[PDB]
Amino acid sequence: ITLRTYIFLDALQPQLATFIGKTARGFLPVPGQASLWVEIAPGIAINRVTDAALKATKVQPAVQVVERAYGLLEVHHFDQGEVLAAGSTILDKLEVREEGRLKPQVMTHQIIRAVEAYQTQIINRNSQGMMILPGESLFILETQPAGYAVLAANEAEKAANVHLVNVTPYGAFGRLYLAGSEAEIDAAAEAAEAAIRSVSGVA
Amino acid sequence: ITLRTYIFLDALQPQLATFIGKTARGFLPVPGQASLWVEIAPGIAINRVTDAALKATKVQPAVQVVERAYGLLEVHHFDQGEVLAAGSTILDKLEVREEGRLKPQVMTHQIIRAVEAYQTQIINRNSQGMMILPGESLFILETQPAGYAVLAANEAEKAANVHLVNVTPYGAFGRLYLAGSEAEIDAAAEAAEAAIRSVSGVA
Amino acid sequence: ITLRTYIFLDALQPQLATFIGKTARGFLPVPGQASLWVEIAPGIAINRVTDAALKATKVQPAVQVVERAYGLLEVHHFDQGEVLAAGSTILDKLEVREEGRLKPQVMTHQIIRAVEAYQTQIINRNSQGMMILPGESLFILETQPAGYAVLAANEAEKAANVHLVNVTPYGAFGRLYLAGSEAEIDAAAEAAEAAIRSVSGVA
Amino acid sequence: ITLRTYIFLDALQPQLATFIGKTARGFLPVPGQASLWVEIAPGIAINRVTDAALKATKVQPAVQVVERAYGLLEVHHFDQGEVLAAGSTILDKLEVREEGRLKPQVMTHQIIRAVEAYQTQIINRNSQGMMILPGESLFILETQPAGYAVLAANEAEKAANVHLVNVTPYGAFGRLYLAGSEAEIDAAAEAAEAAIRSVSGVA
Amino acid sequence: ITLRTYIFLDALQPQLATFIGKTARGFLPVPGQASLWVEIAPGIAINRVTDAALKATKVQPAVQVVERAYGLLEVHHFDQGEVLAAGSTILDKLEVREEGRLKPQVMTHQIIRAVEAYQTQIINRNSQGMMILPGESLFILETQPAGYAVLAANEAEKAANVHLVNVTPYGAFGRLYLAGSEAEIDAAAEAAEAAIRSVSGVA
Amino acid sequence: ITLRTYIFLDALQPQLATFIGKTARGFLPVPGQASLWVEIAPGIAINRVTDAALKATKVQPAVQVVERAYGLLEVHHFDQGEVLAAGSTILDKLEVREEGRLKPQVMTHQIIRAVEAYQTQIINRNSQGMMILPGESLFILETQPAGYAVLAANEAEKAANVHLVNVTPYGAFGRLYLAGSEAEIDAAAEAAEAAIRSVSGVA
Amino acid sequence: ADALGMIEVRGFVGMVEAADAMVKAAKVELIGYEKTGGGYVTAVVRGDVAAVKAATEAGQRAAERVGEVVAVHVIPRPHVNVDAALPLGRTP
Amino acid sequence: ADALGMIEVRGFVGMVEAADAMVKAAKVELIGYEKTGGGYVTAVVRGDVAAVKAATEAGQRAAERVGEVVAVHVIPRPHVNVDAALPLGRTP
Amino acid sequence: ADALGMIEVRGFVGMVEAADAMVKAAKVELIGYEKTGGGYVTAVVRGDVAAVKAATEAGQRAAERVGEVVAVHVIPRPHVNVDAALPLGRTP
Amino acid sequence: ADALGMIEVRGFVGMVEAADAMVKAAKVELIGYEKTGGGYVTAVVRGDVAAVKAATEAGQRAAERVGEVVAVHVIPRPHVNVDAALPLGRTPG
Amino acid sequence: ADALGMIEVRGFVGMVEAADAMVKAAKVELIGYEKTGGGYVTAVVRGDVAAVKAATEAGQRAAERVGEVVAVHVIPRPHVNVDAALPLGRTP
To answer: Which residues are registered as beta bridge partners of A56?
Structure first.
């Protein structure tokens, strides 16, 4: 079993906590809470992987997605000690270590300034976050592995008052789509890209 | 074959043309045009009325549904004249003046400030539009009939710095949710509530 | 318990058993059999009534649902006798003869010729059945109650070369859409509208 | 604002919190807690009321919807006191005492034994909960309004060895389905119907 | 023609017929009926593989799913004699025999004793079979190829009174999820595991 | 950028315009208008091609579908002069032309005459176009790459008055399902196959 | 051996529209028609009882608009002699 | 399933002029005639429903000048089983 | 041959709305108009048989609102010679 | 596809004052006039629908004070087949 | 050229709220304003005819709440001489 991504977020930001909560189908997360999300394979091992965290601590499970091959389990909890514990607690089941995680690599990045009306109709109609309004700029970024995309969202909303159009930490590359003015999008794209690069791991 | 709503939208405010369309599965509108709105009972005549407009004009329809109850009519186009021409024929199919429409009722309009971090994620189950960040504020409206509401949703953003939540011109009642920083909601509601009552009609 | 519809379908014409099936998530019928249709309020007695039929006969049911409002009952089988036997048990459970059913109402029946190239593509959003080619013609019916409609939908293709669109035996009202080349609809609709009045019932 | 249901649930029996939660898209409850139930029209005042609970107490909401008709509110927590504190504030927002609730109506209550193998899979079209094995038995109840059912649904399993089918605290009427071997259902149903009549209220 | 999976069950047990019936979109099965399910590739041959069976016998088509590469077609009939006609015709349709079939192999198995409430909310919330109640034990089994999953449920419910939470025999690995008390989870999983090991075939 | 398939249709046939409209979620198409659909890789990279394409011309963007790897984006407008521009505008952004495209190759083709009722229930049950009626013939064809399937529909309806039950040019290999009488299917299947084989290009 | 059902209508048209509606309403086999002279013609259908009595009612109801319907009757089991002498299809 | 139009007339002459005026009115096919005795005669035509609809209305109006017209009927889709057993020009 | 639809109005305006409504109501071809002088004007449309019949009914009801409508008539399949000598759009 | 306005007047003078009053009332192009014989003449106007609607209802009230005004009508979109067979100033030839 | 539309008020405030609501209500170009002295100021918009008449109605409706509205008028086609002399933007 290979643990792909395991990134602990200092505190889920105000927009993403809604965006994660607006789409999650399990125990809902809440704003301001610290959260650790762990991605591993095979997905059948997640039922035991998450259960190790839940049985040892009082944390709340935000997302546990077992796909055909990859599995992601995300935990959130008000107890900072339990949140730091569960990641160390979860990994100490699957005979792996922290540096053993896969280091995320930014797959693709594209900034399209001033989204057109025709694109404005198409953009958010396939999105579950905020609606992309006409005239605004939209930055589409993809990260590999996918789970590291959550750090992008927490990085953008904290550093700028932007709108999270989409976030999916399931798949080959995680999709993070943010919208706002040209300048507001500029700082976020810088903070998101550097954040993916500093994640420790292997190749 | 009675008449309920007859609202003529001047030039839509941008962010609606997204949410208007992304909810709809018809000829999506775009920001800066004009649109028309008519509720009639019983809910098939809409489909017949839609031709008299479409045949006698150069318009384009966004809403055509009976997913809620019976159906509702909107047509849109850039030229105010073309739409007003479409409207003039629609009522003429029924041979009814403007002033035959029902006066709207104002059921529940109240402002809620600093919503607790919980209630945000749950409203967003209806993530048809924007998300209520944790602890901004929310405006809520109900009118009879339902078609009048999209007018209200317009006059809001036309007058304040608001995030639009969700809109119901469908159903037995027209219900509306608004989101954004605190003072604007106070400024928005004053415009919306004033928009609905000022209409002249019959009880 | 009260009675709304009591319609006995002789031998369905083919394209219904198709469209019937995609609408149903129960025992799909096939073309050439017989089926029964009875509407009652409240929609739980429906579930009990189905036994008296199902237990006392060799039938097979497709519609048993409350996706619209309260529920409606249809059962199907090849032998008219078995069904007519099955039906007779249902009314006797209520101890009401045939003529206790509600007389049908004819709300909106109109024929539309050369539908605009736009309107075709959008109606098929209600794709329970076939698509209105661009610029043929369309027939639309409303009746109260709702169950009575499928009888009419039968008499259509059984009487003309028509394409069947969509049927509503669900809801407070029975609404119908038809499509096909032009002259048939007049000969088709003439049969449909005539089918509803010819029913005998109580005021 | 008007009052319909005001039910205070003591300690949920386990298997509800599943079907309660697996049906819900909000803050899922868990078995062993306490929950509250109040129905009011129109279904937006619910959205405001939910705060008065959340602002004045330590609770958590599961049901907040208008997917059925107008909305309904439940809040839950382990300490009876906290909930009873939360509930008492809600009515005080309305300036209404406890006993203003409508007495429930007992519309259709019947027990159905040894259902035919057909009807099993077809009921499961409503696959919100457990499956009616072929040939156990089924209980069916109707009440107005809808909120009262979860009280009945609770007191049932609390009193008998039953499998829970499907529940309607949403809608214009409260309808109930139960599954299991025979004697339990007869023993189960007696508790539910007794729960509904015993409520004290206004005509 | 590549025959992937083909296991014919002598008689569907009482619970599984609902589980197979609870998800299908074709001819529903019934309890006590014998059923043959054949999985082959390419998926375009399933339309012909079933077509040989449907034209030769009076069987009913239960499942026909065209996936990315593999295809599964299931037929059911109460008459044990009917199974021999289509199956030999089905095997001869794709040209094969008995020793050519795939020998079943148990891929992965894990039993998590005493499921916690947090998992009870997460487990069945993505399931359409029985609901997983809090505190019960859950046994998760996986079979390779996917078609062999049908034998898992039929073996468990026959040998023990367990509850089927989910069953999916479409995909790369077939999913079998059974739940129950500590002892009951043991015996059913034992009967299911031996069935994969005793299945004659090749690799 | 990988140019897989790019076929410009002179004029969308009468039926296909409905089927495209019955499934698209963007700018709806209209009958008789010419439309070009472009297939490129990566599927996340199509968002840049159309966003580049939409700002350069007056075409309307109909569909933006994100598949696993390949992406197809189609723009529609009746004016043939605009149609040639966007492709050259799109292709010159992907730094290629037309002869560089992949030449289509017919993967698999089978016509099943006289579908049985059991298949008629299952056939249209997986379709969103016209319903498959019992007794008619249905022709199933597959094209490689998948995007090239659209030429089949415009060719069939032009040469014969046939009905398209389903058409999906999204995925790895395109599925085209057409239904009709024995003779009418013969000429179209002849015209469609020659059309897929005669498409000029490379491999 | 099937059951019987007949309609006779002063007017070859009335017979057809009657004979039509019968076929469209049930699974019965229309054997033909018998000319008795004087403008009177009789339609003849055969099949199971439940089918015919349901089909025949549709014939009577459909011909009365456009015909002078003379007589309509149903025999659930004609004695063996009838099928042997009269031209009612099932004739050995 | 070509449509079906029928004119019945108490007088051979009526049927002829009725038949003639019909084939001249729309694109329909005159298939023959049926003698029911009693002086009643019936013309039969097939074709498009719109054609039959318009042809029949032109025949009825043309025969009333001559002999008394008994009946006038039009069947859009006659069932397959009719054209098989009755002599209506489309017996396979 | 193609059907024939005609409308004769004593006001040029009446003809246009009469003309427009028809081509808006059915798949018909508008060939032209022939002004016979004296304020009388006649619009001519050709197409399918029923489409014309439906087109006229839509024009007559539409034209009566703004003019002295005079005559509305429909010919399903005119003779070959008619199209050959008259300016009715189907001339070789 | 620009809209269409018409006025038919028994007598020449009415048509002109009907015409002249229109083009002064709103933004419209007068394309010509049509003689249907019998003294009847007709003015034809094209433009956006708001102008013609405002133009005609200004011309009628201005022609009604001179001669017998027969009819007044406005089409917000003549079908493309009309502009081809009829002389309405937008014939593609 | 383009159409015209004006509001004049006794109070620079009253004009602005009117000038706003007009722009928000239609697709018109706000050219500026002309100071007539004595507290009277006049807003001037130009654009499509339907736009102005719809824009103006919203403005007048909006200034009456907070202003002393003096006059509201719309010209659909100003004669070329006006645009040449008066300052309404569209000045060659």
So the answer is: none
Query: Burial level of I70, CB count in 10 A (0-12/13-18/19+)?
Result: middle
Q: What is the DSSP string of E127-151?
A: -SSSPPPTT-EEEEEEEESGGGHHH
Could you tell me if C123 lies within 8 Å of chain B, comparing CB atoms?
A: yes
In a domain, G23, yes or no: yes
**Residue of I50, I53, I76 with shortest CB distance to H25:** I76
Chain B contact set for K26 (CB, 8 A):
10-11, 80
CA nearest neighbour of C4 among C147, C133, C113, C119: C147
Q: Which of A4, A36, A26, A9 is nearest to A152 (CA)?
A: A9
**H22 touching chain I per CB within 8 A:** no
Number of domains forming the structure of chain G: 1
- Structural domains in chain B plus CATH codes: 3-102 (3.30.70.1710), 103-199 (3.30.70.1710)
Q: Which two tokens stand for residue K44?
A: 């001037």
- Against chain H, the chains showing at least 3 CB pairs within 8 Å are C, G, I
On whether any CB of chain D is under 8 Å from the CB of C31, the answer is no
Domain containing H70 equals 1-84
- Distance spanning both ends of chain H, measured CA to CA: 12
- DSSP at I28: E
Cβ contact, residue pair F31, C117, below 8 Å: yes
Residue at I62 is within a domain:
yes
Task: Give a yes or no: residue G68 inside a domain.
Answer: yes
Task: Give C153's Cβ-side CA count (13 Å radius).
Answer: 29
CA–CA gap between residue F3 and residue F42 (Å, rounded) = 10
Residues 57-76 on H with a CB inside 8 Å of I are none
B82:J49 CB<8 A: yes
CA distance to partner chain E, nearest, from residue D165 (Å): 10
Question: Cβ of J20 under 8 Å from any chain K Cβ?
Answer: no
Q: Does D24 touch chain A (CB under 8 A)?
A: no
Tell me A104's DSSP state: P
C-alpha A52/C-alpha A50 separation (Å) is: 5
CATH of the domain at K16: 3.30.70.1710
Q: Which two tokens stand for residue A141?
A: 């970024």
Q: Give partners of D (≥3 CB pairs < 8 A).
A: A, B, C, E
- Position I92 in a domain: no
How far apart (Å, rounded) are the C-alpha atoms in residues D142 and D147?
11
- CB of H18 within 8 A of CB of H72? no
Rounded Cα distance, F27 and B60, in Å: 11
Looking at chain B, which residue has its C-alpha nearest residue D50? B119
Contact list in C for residue G24 (CB cut-off 8 A) is 11, 13, 158
* Cβ atoms A165, A135 nearer than 8 A: no
CA distance D143 to B125: 28
Q: Tell me, what amino acid is at A176? A: L
Q: Which of E127, E107, E187, E116 is nearest to E155 (CA)?
A: E187
Which chain H residues are within 8 Å of C158, Cβ to Cβ? 77
DSSP class of D30: -
- CA angle (H64 as vertex; H62, H66 as ends), nearest 5: 90
Contact: F27, B26; criterion CB under 8 Å: no
**D25, D47, D61 ranked by CB distance to B140: nearest:** D47
